[PDB]
Enzyme design. Structure first.
Site, PDB file in Angstrom:
ATOM      1  N   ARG A 190       9.571   1.135   7.523  1.00  0.00           N
ATOM      2  CA  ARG A 190       8.204   0.658   7.315  1.00  0.00           C
ATOM      3  C   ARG A 190       8.015  -0.858   7.397  1.00  0.00           C
ATOM      4  O   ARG A 190       8.859  -1.589   7.008  1.00  0.00           O
ATOM      5  CB  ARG A 190       7.776   1.057   5.925  1.00  0.00           C
ATOM      6  CG  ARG A 190       7.407   2.522   5.795  1.00  0.00           C
ATOM      7  CD  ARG A 190       7.268   2.932   4.359  1.00  0.00           C
ATOM      8  NE  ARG A 190       6.441   4.119   4.282  1.00  0.00           N
ATOM      9  CZ  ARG A 190       6.724   5.286   4.875  1.00  0.00           C
ATOM     10  NH1 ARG A 190       7.823   5.475   5.658  1.00  0.00           N
ATOM     11  NH2 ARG A 190       5.884   6.300   4.684  1.00  0.00           N
TER      12      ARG A 190
ATOM     13  N   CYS B   3       4.868  -4.136   7.568  1.00  0.00           N
ATOM     14  CA  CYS B   3       3.495  -4.567   7.489  1.00  0.00           C
ATOM     15  C   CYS B   3       3.457  -6.015   7.806  1.00  0.00           C
ATOM     16  O   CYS B   3       4.413  -6.728   7.530  1.00  0.00           O
ATOM     17  CB  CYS B   3       2.958  -4.399   6.085  1.00  0.00           C
ATOM     18  SG  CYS B   3       2.936  -2.685   5.617  1.00  0.00           S
TER      19      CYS B   3
END
Lengths: 119, 108, 108, 108
Positions: free
Chosen positions: A96, A98
């Site tokens: 993940r 971001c």
């Protein structure tokens, strides 16, 4: 030219909680206490030197990183940062990831926080 | 600065329990959280946002056990309005801070 | 399928409030919450994880006002252990669902 | 499968790369990612929101290796505006889905 990390203080160390390391936001501080010199890639290398240090203290590495969040003031700057990010997460890529525009501290153009397994 | 405006959103940086003179609110986690909300009031209004326009809020605390207390306060500034999203995270706060809050808000 | 495992981390699918018999559960938001926890508990033991090794939970919720109550239920299953991160978020659920829950977990 | 509007904000459900015809599209991840954007175009315009009003996008992919591709596609519609935040996450997708985007957008 790679560089040495800032010494880690109490507040820059991050925290370890139920087997996960959560680094604080690591800025491109040099061991002087000054934003390293350069365009944004040079600052990113520094942020990485600082990442490596606090990982190593907490018993982690880049290979156990399971999330990394990139803060920057302008999303334009992302590509240059990701250029650099790819040399450290290369044959390992955190599951993940971001990117997120934010007010940085004075003269910083990039900050990175990472979540990491402590084997 | 206390944040950044982009594309009609305001993204606050984390507000901690400082008075305007900059001296830490020395007091329990509810006392502190009120002061944090009072700092949020000011940065929100400074940005042309209000509590009503907060769409996310993220709470940072040392211990997840201290959430109930923070929430009992969160819920007095956000009652007729409840941000659509909210995170809570365990983190190392600055010296003597028991609570720190960030907000994302629409600037109308 | 309901899950994926990367770098020793179990990343669960959103667990909605269905019975083993295929039917939405019989009651208010607590019962639904309970059912989602019974459901999640099984998807976790299946992965080599447990409630104790959960590190994030995302509560998808239909009506942010009912979080007080989902949270009374979260407290029962995460009593001793509380995950270090969680988010609540408003979302469109399957007709009849008032709550859905995803977790990130460690597989020792 | 609709999505939500709260406090002037569209929260899209996750757009998979389906045609107008229910058919999973014929391609590499690059051709897929173009369909997802076709379908974001629609739901965005039905909701009262454009790609220019997107304040966050999230990409679900089954392999982080394919991000440099999707990001090239992403580049074409998010060009002269980039969403202030975005995430990318490894999860499981349903059929021949390499990629999947949901997004959050302003409306008036």
């Amino acid at each position: 030219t790679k560089h040495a990390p800032a010494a880690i203080g109490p507040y820059s160390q991050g925290i370890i909680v139920n087997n996960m390391f959560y680094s604080s936001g690591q800025i491109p501080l040099t061991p002087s206490g000054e934003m390293v010199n350069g365009d944004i890639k040079e600052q990113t290398h520094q942020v990485f030197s600082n990442l490596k240090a606090v990982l190593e203290e907490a018993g982690a590495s880049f290979e156990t990183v399971v999330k990394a969040t990139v803060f920057i003031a302008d999303m334009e700057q992302f590509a240059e940062v990701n250029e650099v990010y790819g040399q450290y997460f290369d044959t390992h890529k955190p599951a993940r990831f971001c990117v997120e525009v934010a007010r940085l501290p004075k003269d910083a153009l990039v900050e990175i926080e990472v979540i990491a397994l402590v084997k």
